[PDB]
Design a protein around this nucleic acid. Structure first.
Ligand SMILES: [Mg+2]
Ligand SMILES: [Mg+2]
Ligand SMILES: [Mg+2]
Ligand SMILES: [Mg+2]
Ligand SMILES: [Mg+2]
Ligand SMILES: [Mg+2]
Ligand SMILES: [Mg+2]
Ligand SMILES: [Mg+2]
Lengths: 54, 84, 177, 136, 104
RNA sequence: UCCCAAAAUGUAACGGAGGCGCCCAAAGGUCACCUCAAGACGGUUGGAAAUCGUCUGUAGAGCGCAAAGGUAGAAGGUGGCUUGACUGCGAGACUGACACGUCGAGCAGGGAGGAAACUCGGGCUUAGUGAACCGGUGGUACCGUGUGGAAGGGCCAUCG
RNA sequence: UCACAAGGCUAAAACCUUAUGAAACUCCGAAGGGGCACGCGUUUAGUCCGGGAGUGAGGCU
């Protein structure tokens, strides 16, 4: 996207599984400031819960 | 002397056409999946047989024939009914 | 509490004074309604701490924080902020707090020959808000800071204004003369 | 004369005059015959004309009103770069439509004050008297 | 106001779901639970309570909800969709439910 | 986006106004619940406008921003739980010269709210975007040159 | 909804009688126009697949 934009930074969601997987979305960073905990699917099994990876 | 102007313009803008209007009219057939109407809002209300995508598009849930009704001016639906 | 049976001293006080068809057809009093509307200017956490303690000790009931009706006039206004506080009192606690008034609020009033007897709710109801806070059985200067004031509105199922007039008055109310 | 605030700009078209072809407000009334345009000054003209004639002062009803922005490009440019700034204002008077109603004067004053009025305009004209009675 | 009743009334997508509407009137101490094909403007069950209830008041629930579901199972009507109106679904009409939810 | 555009879609102009290159972790999914702008009277700070009260009250409001269409049986206002802002797909159509783009029932794996019938693969919708190429990165074990390995490459993902 | 002619009336804003203008107003709203069907009555074209193109400056009522 538009590089020097500090709010709504695009970061991915890596599974707690270790399947080898990742989603990709955008938090406002005027919000979370720590990380993100979401509950998405995972082809390499069924239902993981993801940590907002660096 | 002659002319130097110098004025410009600040408009001259528009957007490429959005092909709206009712696509499938009233009394013609249909197939399932077939879109019957495109619209901005609820210009045409989902009737019995028809579904409404995000656009408020009207699509057909199963085949048959197309039935229009306006409810005495301002409220209006299209439905489907088979060939029997 | 007893003001219940007092209402019932009124029931045929006017069913025998007037000429009504029935006993439910004579003006009851749904809710007393209190508005602690600081607002416009006063935007301190402390004055709503205070309005809260105050309201919740005088009427023994939690206060609802009424906000800015998105009205943002030329002065100091905006959208989501406390510009009025509210506590609706009805039935039981209504009769209790109203008795707290006629008993320990109305005489306590510094300078008081009764209150405004001009036609209120033209539909035949009432309001009456009143300034002063230093005329109370609960509001103490020894338990507050500076001086505030209340704004009250009582609802009466009267048909016209003379009938509310009569109602409120025979119930224990001074109309200044 | 001019108006207060608006849209800004325009266009043009014709075909006969809607309303109101009837003699309200006055006893005597002057009526257009041609699908003209009419300007702020073109009417302020007749204002000051008839208002000369009637003295102190009559009762004068300007049934028309300029609302149309007409433009002219800056003189001497080749077209393009814009539409013309707003030159002047126009009342789009169509025929049968009645422009002036007066009373509070007599028949002679109507004839003459209307004569002098109509000698200031792009139109042949007919003056008359009431009877148009669909609604007073 | 009305709002709630007409709200649920339309979230019972009238006939298009295929099934059978199941009314109620737990706002009085005489109720009315009904059964409708709504498309066809007719009623097919009917468990009143005004022709002698039992004696109970909101205990009557499970009972006219058992009487209804009985008249249903008798008619043949083997499938539910639960209309209401101004009702929370929690207590009384919820009883009517549970004992209709296994009662026909 | 709106006229211009001649009541179907479409249509030019250095014609006439205005807006986008984001925003939203709740402003989304579900579940439940609430109703609006104003004017009149009457009311402690106030007193044009604040707060409360009543009578009026189908929209004269609200929708994150542009307007048009839309909307009160909610899309508007408030809470409960929540990660359907989900992989594997795609019946059938809208649209475009192509490339694109737009809508979508239904099936599977597997979930979420409801007690349920249900509803959901983002938001009322239509702007919030950049084809290839070369390269970064997380998987993957298809290719790897006498052979088995590794470089490198392919595929899914994705970042510039 | 923006505009605006007179007059009422009040403290002017509203609102009443009288009154009118609108591409970006619409309680209303044709004539026509388009899709589908039928062919009830005429006429000839259409559509697909494959070969060869040219044209892509238009002009007037
Ligand atoms: Mg056309
Ligand atoms: Mg062209
Ligand atoms: Mg290249
Ligand atoms: Mg790699
Ligand atoms: Mg490798
Ligand atoms: Mg009519
Ligand atoms: Mg060329
Ligand atoms: Mg040409």
């Amino acid at each position: 996207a538009a590089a020097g934009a500090a709010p709504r930074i695009i970061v991915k969601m890596e599974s707690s599984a270790g399947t080898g997987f990742y989603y990709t979305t955008t938090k406002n960073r005027r919000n979370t400031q720590a990380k993100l905990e979401l509950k998405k699917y995972d082809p390499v099994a069924a239902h993981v819960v993801f940590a907002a990876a660096a | 002397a002659h002319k130097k102007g110098v004025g410009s313009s600040k408009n001259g803008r528009d957007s490429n056409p959005k092909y709206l209007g009712v696509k499938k009219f009233g009394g013609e057939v249909v197939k399932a999946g077939n879109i019957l109407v495109r619209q901005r809002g609820t210009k045409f209300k989902a009737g019995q047989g028809v579904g409404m995508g995000r656009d408020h598009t009207l699509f057909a849930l199963s085949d048959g024939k197309v039935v229009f009704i306006n409810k005495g001016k301002g409220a209006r639906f299209i439905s489907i009914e088979a060939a029997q | 509490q007893l003001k219940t049976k007092y209402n019932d001293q009124v029931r045929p006080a006017l069913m025998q004074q007037f000429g009504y068809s029935s006993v439910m057809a004579v003006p009851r009093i749904e809710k007393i309604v209190v508005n602690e509307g600081l607002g416009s200017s006063k935007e301190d956490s402390k004055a709503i701490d205070k309005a809260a303690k105050e309201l919740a000790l005088i009427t023994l009931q939690k206060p609802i924080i009424t906000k800015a009706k998105k009205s943002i006039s030329n002065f100091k206004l905006r959208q989501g902020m406390p510009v009025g506080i509210k506590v609706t009192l009805r039935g039981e606690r209504m009769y209790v707090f109203l008795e707290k008034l006629i008993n320990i609020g109305l005489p306590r009033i510094r300078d008081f020959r009764g209150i405004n007897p001009n036609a209120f709710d033209g539909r035949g109801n009432y309001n009456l808000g009143i300034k002063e806070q230093l005329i109370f059985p609960e509001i103490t200067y020894d338990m507050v800071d500076k001086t505030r004031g209340m704004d009250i509105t009582i609802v009466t199922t009267a048909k016209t204004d003379e009938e509310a007039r009569a109602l409120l008055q025979s119930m224990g109310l001074p109309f200044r003369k | 004369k001019r108006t207060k605030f608006r849209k800004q700009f325009r266009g043009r078209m014709t075909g006969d005059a809607k309303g109101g072809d009837y003699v309200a407000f006055g006893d005597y009334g002057l009526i257009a015959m041609e699908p003209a345009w009419i300007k702020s000054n073109q009417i302020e003209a007749c204002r000051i004309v008839m208002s000369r004639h009637f003295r102190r002062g009559g009762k004068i009803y300007i049934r028309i009103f300029p609302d149309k922005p007409v433009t002219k490009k800056p003189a001497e440019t080749r077209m393009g770069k814009g539409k013309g700034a707003v030159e002047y204002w126009v009342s789009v008077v169509k025929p049968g439509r009645v422009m002036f109603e007066v009373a509070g004067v007599t028949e002679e004053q109507a004839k003459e004050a209307f004569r002098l009025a109509g000698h200031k305009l792009p139109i042949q004209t007919k003056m008359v008297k009431r009877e148009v009675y669909d609604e007073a | 106001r009305r709002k709630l009743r007409t709200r649920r009334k339309v979230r019972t997508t009238t006939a298009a779901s295929g099934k059978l509407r199941l009314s109620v009137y737990r706002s009085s101490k005489h109720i009315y639970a009904q059964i409708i094909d709504d498309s066809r403007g007719q009623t097919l069950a009917a468990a009143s309570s005004a022709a002698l209830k039992s004696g109970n008041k909101t205990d009557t629930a499970a009972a006219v909800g058992k009487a209804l579901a009985a008249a249903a199972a008798e008619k043949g009507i083997k499938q539910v969709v639960f209309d209401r109106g101004s009702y929370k679904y929690h207590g009384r009409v919820k009883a009517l439910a549970d004992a209709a939810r296994e009662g026909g």
